[PDB]
Amino acid sequence: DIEIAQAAKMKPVMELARGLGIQEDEVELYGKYKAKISLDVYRRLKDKPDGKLILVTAITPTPAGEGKTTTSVGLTDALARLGKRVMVCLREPSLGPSFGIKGGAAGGGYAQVVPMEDINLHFTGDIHAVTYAHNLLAAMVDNHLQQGNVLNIDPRTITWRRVIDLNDRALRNIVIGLGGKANGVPRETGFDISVASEVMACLCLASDLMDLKERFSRIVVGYTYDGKPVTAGDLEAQGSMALLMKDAIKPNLVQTLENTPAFIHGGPFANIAHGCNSIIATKTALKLADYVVTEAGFGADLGAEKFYDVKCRYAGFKPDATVIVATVRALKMHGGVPKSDLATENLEALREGFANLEKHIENIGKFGVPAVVAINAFPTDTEAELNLLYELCAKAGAEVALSWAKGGEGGLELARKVLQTLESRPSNFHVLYNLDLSIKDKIAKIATEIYGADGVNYTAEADKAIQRYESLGYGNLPVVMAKTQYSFSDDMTKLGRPRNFTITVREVRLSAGGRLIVPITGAIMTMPGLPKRPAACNIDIDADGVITG
Amino acid sequence: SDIEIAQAAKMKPVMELARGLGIQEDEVELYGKYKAKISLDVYRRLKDKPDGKLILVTAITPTPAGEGKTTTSVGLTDALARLGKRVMVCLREPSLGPSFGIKGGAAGGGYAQVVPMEDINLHFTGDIHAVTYAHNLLAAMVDNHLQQGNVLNIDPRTITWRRVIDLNDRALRNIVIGLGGKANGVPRETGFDISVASEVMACLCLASDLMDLKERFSRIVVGYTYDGKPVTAGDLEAQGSMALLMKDAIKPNLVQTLENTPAFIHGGPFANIAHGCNSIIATKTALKLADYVVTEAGFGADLGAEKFYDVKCRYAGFKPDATVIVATVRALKMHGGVPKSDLATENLEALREGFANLEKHIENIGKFGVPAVVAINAFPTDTEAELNLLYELCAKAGAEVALSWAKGGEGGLELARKVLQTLESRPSNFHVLYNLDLSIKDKIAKIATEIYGADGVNYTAEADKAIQRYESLGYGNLPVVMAKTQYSFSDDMTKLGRPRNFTITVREVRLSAGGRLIVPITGAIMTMPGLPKRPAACNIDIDADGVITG
Ligand SMILES: Nc1ncnc2c1ncn2[C@@H]1O[C@H](COP(=O)(O)OP(=O)(O)OP(O)(O)=S)[C@@H](O)[C@H]1O
Ligand SMILES: Nc1ncnc2c1ncn2[C@@H]1O[C@H](COP(=O)(O)OP(=O)(O)OP(O)(O)=S)[C@@H](O)[C@H]1O
Numbered sequence A: 001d002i003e004i005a006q007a008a009k010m011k012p013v014m015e016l017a018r019g020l021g022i023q024e025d026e027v028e029l030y031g032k033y034k035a036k037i038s039l040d041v042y043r044r045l046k047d048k049p050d051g052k053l054i055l056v057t058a059i060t061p062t063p064a065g066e067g068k069t070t071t072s073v074g075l076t077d078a079l080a081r082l083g084k085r086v087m088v089c090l091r092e093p094s095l096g097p098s099f100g101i102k103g104g105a106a107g108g109g110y111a112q113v114v115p116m117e118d119i120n121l122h123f124t125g126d127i128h129a130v131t132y133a134h135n136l137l138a139a140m141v142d143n144h145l146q147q148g149n150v151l152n153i154d155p156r157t158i159t160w161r162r163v164i165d166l167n168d169r170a171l172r173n174i175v176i177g178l179g180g181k182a183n184g185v186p187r188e189t190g191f192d193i194s195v196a197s198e199v200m201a202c203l204c205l206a207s208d209l210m211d212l213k214e215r216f217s218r219i220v221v222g223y224t225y226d227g228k229p230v231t232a233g234d235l236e237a238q239g240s241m242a243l244l245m246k247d248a249i250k251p252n253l254v255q256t257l258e259n260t261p262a263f264i265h266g267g268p269f270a271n272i273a274h275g276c277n278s279i280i281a282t283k284t285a286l287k288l289a290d291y292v293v294t295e296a297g298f299g300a301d302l303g304a305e306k307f308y309d310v311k312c313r314y315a316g317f318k319p320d321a322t323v324i325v326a327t328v329r330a331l332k333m334h335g336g337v338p339k340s341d342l343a344t345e346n347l348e349a350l351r352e353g354f355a356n357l358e359k360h361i362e363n364i365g366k367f368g369v370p371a372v373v374a375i376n377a378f379p380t381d382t383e384a385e386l387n388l389l390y391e392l393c394a395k396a397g398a399e400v401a402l403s404w405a406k407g408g409e410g411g412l413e414l415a416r417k418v419l420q421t422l423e424s425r426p427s428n429f430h431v432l433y434n435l436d437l438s439i440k441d442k443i444a445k446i447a448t449e450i451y452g453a454d455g456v457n458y459t460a461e462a463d464k465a466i467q468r469y470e471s472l473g474y475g476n477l478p479v480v481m482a483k484t485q486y487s488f489s490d491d492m493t494k495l496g497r498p499r500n501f502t503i504t505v506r507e508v509r510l511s512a513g514g515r516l517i518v519p520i521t522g523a524i525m526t527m528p529g530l531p532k533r534p535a536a537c538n539i540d541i542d543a544d545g546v547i548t549g
Numbered sequence B: 001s002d003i004e005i006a007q008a009a010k011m012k013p014v015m016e017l018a019r020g021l022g023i024q025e026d027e028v029e030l031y032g033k034y035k036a037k038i039s040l041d042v043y044r045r046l047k048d049k050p051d052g053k054l055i056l057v058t059a060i061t062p063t064p065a066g067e068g069k070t071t072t073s074v075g076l077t078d079a080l081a082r083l084g085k086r087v088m089v090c091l092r093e094p095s096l097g098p099s100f101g102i103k104g105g106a107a108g109g110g111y112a113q114v115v116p117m118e119d120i121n122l123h124f125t126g127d128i129h130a131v132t133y134a135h136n137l138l139a140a141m142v143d144n145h146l147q148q149g150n151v152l153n154i155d156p157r158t159i160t161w162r163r164v165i166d167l168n169d170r171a172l173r174n175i176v177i178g179l180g181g182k183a184n185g186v187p188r189e190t191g192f193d194i195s196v197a198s199e200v201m202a203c204l205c206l207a208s209d210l211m212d213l214k215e216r217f218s219r220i221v222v223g224y225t226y227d228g229k230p231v232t233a234g235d236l237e238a239q240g241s242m243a244l245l246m247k248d249a250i251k252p253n254l255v256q257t258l259e260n261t262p263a264f265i266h267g268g269p270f271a272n273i274a275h276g277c278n279s280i281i282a283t284k285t286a287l288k289l290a291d292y293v294v295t296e297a298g299f300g301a302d303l304g305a306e307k308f309y310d311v312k313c314r315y316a317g318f319k320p321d322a323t324v325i326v327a328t329v330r331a332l333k334m335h336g337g338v339p340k341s342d343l344a345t346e347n348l349e350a351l352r353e354g355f356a357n358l359e360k361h362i363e364n365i366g367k368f369g370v371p372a373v374v375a376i377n378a379f380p381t382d383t384e385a386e387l388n389l390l391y392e393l394c395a396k397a398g399a400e401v402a403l404s405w406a407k408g409g410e411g412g413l414e415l416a417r418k419v420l421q422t423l424e425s426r427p428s429n430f431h432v433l434y435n436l437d438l439s440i441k442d443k444i445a446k447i448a449t450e451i452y453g454a455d456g457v458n459y460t461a462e463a464d465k466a467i468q469r470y471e472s473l474g475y476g477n478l479p480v481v482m483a484k485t486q487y488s489f490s491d492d493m494t495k496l497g498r499p500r501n502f503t504i505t506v507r508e509v510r511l512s513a514g515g516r517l518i519v520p521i522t523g524a525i526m527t528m529p530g531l532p533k534r535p536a537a538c539n540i541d542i543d544a545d546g547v548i549t550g
Helices: A013-018 A040-044 A068-081 A116-120 A126-146 A198-205 A209-218 A238-243 A279-288 A303-315 A328-334 A347-353 A355-365 A383-392 A403-410 A412-424 A439-451 A460-472 B014-021 B041-046 B069-082 B117-121 B127-147 B199-206 B210-217 B239-245 B280-289 B301-316 B329-335 B348-366 B384-393 B404-411 B413-425 B440-452 B461-472
Strands: A027-030 A034-037 A052-058 A086-090 A106-108 A111-114 A162-164 A174-176 A187-189 A191-193 A220-223 A229-231 A252-256 A261-264 A291-295 A321-326 A371-376 A398-401 A455-458 A479-482 A502-505 A516-519 B028-030 B036-038 B053-059 B087-091 B163-165 B175-177 B188-190 B192-194 B221-225 B230-232 B253-257 B262-265 B292-296 B322-327 B372-377 B457-459 B480-483 B504-506 B510-512 B516-520
Touching (some): A013 A034, A013 A252, A068 A086, A068 A291, A068 A321, A068 A371, A068 A398, A126 A162, A126 A198, A198 A209, A198 A303, A261 A279, A279 A291, A279 A303, A303 A355, A303 A479, A328 A347, A355 A371, A371 A383, A371 A412, A398 A412, A403 A412, A439 A460, A439 A479, A439 A502, A455 A460, B014 B028, B014 B253, B014 B262, B041 B280, B053 B301, B069 B087, B069 B292, B069 B372, B069 B404, B127 B163, B127 B199, B127 B221, B127 B239, B199 B210, B199 B301, B210 B239, B262 B280, B280 B301, B301 B348, B301 B480, B322 B348, B348 B384, B372 B413, B404 B413, B440 B461, B440 B504, B457 B461
Parallel strands (some): A052 A291, A052 A321, A086 A261, A086 A291, A455 A502, B053 B322, B087 B262, B087 B292, B163 B192, B322 B372, B457 B504
Antiparallel strands (some): A027 A034, A034 A252, A111 A252, A174 B175, A252 A261, B028 B036, B036 B253, B221 B230
């Protein structure tokens, strides 16, 4: 009965490709229902007009669940119904979690992206391609050391770890290169989940296969003995890294349960990285559709700011609308109601928890972009609970989305407000900070105006880090804040709209292909682990079809 | 010329070739216009139909001078199609790693190639990723189990199951895992072998369908308890999941020769620590779609041909009909003592002396009841006097010259004709070299004695313990898979030719419970090769889309 049990009624992607004016020759199929679209679609429609861009985001995440993706597909079906040319772009899910805790649908209920099972697994192999690009580089680093260490690297400062797309704890901290002189140079490193890879990040912000080629070459792998940074470039790896990505580069065309054309392509981390689907997918989509709907990871404080300040900045996008999702269950949790008690109506809690969404809204304001709230409706979520909220959004447009349950017909109301927004409410999009400010000034501008901290503190380790980067010349880059998503602040316990608090950046990491990363805590969760009773244990496939994936 | 001839190839859509073979559209799964996975439904509905003839191609003891196995197989297949035969060639998928180290070598070679080359050499249909991730999921599961209070009671120090990656990465040979304290796993020594060396890959090649492969996984031994009881993947309830990751990898991939002859590429394991053959699934599907099926085996005939007969044929009921054994003048002369550099110079004496290597392989193939035909892979430097002596010399077997590299199928016409002729007048009487119910040590001697011409076999203490342990754990009625050097009949790689008065030494014996017993000689321990000083990775680029060199 769950979102899986809606495996039913897909149209061959090939014809969809025609329903968009993609030529047959620009389609590399993967069976009938997955295909890869060439980057030629953009290059021949280079100068055509762009359709409108519709970033869906969410309020501060909670154990209550909200529903970005679900609402995003539903936003999409609904626009379909209204005879508009409308595409979605989503992120590809890591394989890892299918076997751990997760194993879920792209969206949900009646607003899903299909075929569900391929998307979760080996899809079109975009992640294996990231994986090999990463590990090849790692290999070249180590081989070089084996080969006499011409570049005079300090093995002890390699910051290039290896990658794999499984929840594997036991690979977090490892020692390689043992066995003697035949078998490499001993050093300490680890693995991270593939999707966390700088290479996954580059895929997602590259203009094209040559932009990818360059960004790879910019990547720092570690430093030499007299502190001079070695690069992917220095190791002549970038060419090979690109070859491995020859196909990953192209976006994947798929569909909605309601046959609405979808791209899913790329999938970065939302803290350590910016957490948007790829730029290739969205700029391509813009030329095939009048209305593109896309999303970002975590809450609008992280995903959206990074959407605007990273993704739009680089790609010359000018977001026209922005939806923000919220649930009643969730806000009550922001009001301080435990996860056990969500069943009960609590109009006073929802009133207090609303402060969260209220801040988020002010932040979408701050970007010169037309906000609109959307509530994913729930079985427990009552009429006085909804009414209390609907009026509480007395500041910016609100609608209810019965999507998870009613399909495109349930996000019919919601899509109206958006289209009314896009016709009557023009945009004035502008990045929050300026790329010539100070790493600190930049962080500060994110902390105060977006989160609402009074100020920012820095550790000893954080300053000699910053120092080095400014003076290594990497100070002109944007800032991608690695912090807990569960609060505006870096204190996860502090839900709602916390006031009179500061932000402390413990460390600073570089991503030379892209931008600058300031961690707030152990965001060190770049490799999660399997649970006591993992899903692998119960996954099976009989003499035909799958139980429990 | 220019062995990226695979550009101008002119490929027929695979779908077209498939319906050409009698495959329905619903049994075809496109990967672009030129690649397809093919349902196991095709075999099922054609189970009752008769097999075509099976032709194995193998070669003489490999050398620095090169021999030409695959080129000859594709070349044969094409020569057969030009003769109007309904034919298929089945080949192994290459590992990705060699592409960035030394190779990125030809689909098959010269005018004998299976294409799309580039994709065959890189991700192809992603069968190797499926193997990598099935294999590592087992590993990750092993570790987490230790991490979760170790109910099954594994001694982590006894875990034989390593990790895997499809790159030449020596630094991953010996590593220490699970560091950082109570939260980060349990410290233990392991390493990574190259993906294609995975037992998960050997299983794929030896499986009959997804259920048997799923079963084979449940028997995989990962380690031992504190008490010495074996612990298996079944015991970790992992086989379902691994099976899941192989849902598509289980289907063979349809592709074509430069001449549009259909071809299957599927699986590609090692030929020492495994049997170096492509998958039973491809081959068995090809026997029902085609009147003739050409396939090959890794290394020389003493290893790959042996294992093809004694492992792959054993499991599948195949009865090989003929065998094409590939040799060159230049390699034979090396075997007769000529150094790599002086190979162009005419030398009928070292040719005569080196022929002993070829003679022996012929003799061996004889021992399975399958008639042999030699293929001479012509080289421009070979004199008439030379080639001619090589024929006189092949006194026992059909001989021919293959010009398959230079002249496509047409160069294979002579060979093709010799095979068809053997097919018609000299039916095989196939039988494996050994019964399963001998002991490990008896089986080994059969192989070492009969096929290597070894005097006998010696064993170290470690070998003796291992064989005693495996036999009492009940794995002693299984086939034996010799991992030795391929550069020699002996396990001294420097003994070329047909060495005599020699002895094999088994140093260490390992178990693959998705099949059988692996017994190593030297450092055939090399299950994770390394990158050279100047790796091909450094001189690879892409521009407009012009993939330069590799
Ligand atoms: N209106 C609804 N009624 C019932 N369940 C819902 C509803 N909306 C979402 N869900 C469930 O909430 C789960 C995920 O909620 P979240 O993870 O907060 O949303 P998300 O992280 O943006 O990704 P999703 O699954 O597309 S909402 C999904 O597995 C859905 O099954
Ligand atoms: N007349 C010829 N001139 C030049 N090269 C030739 C000629 N005939 C054969 N070859 C070689 O045949 C080689 C083909 O190698 P493959 O067939 O891919 O490997 P294989 O021959 O199946 O087994 P190995 O590993 O090479 S011993 C090419 O690399 C060529 O160098």
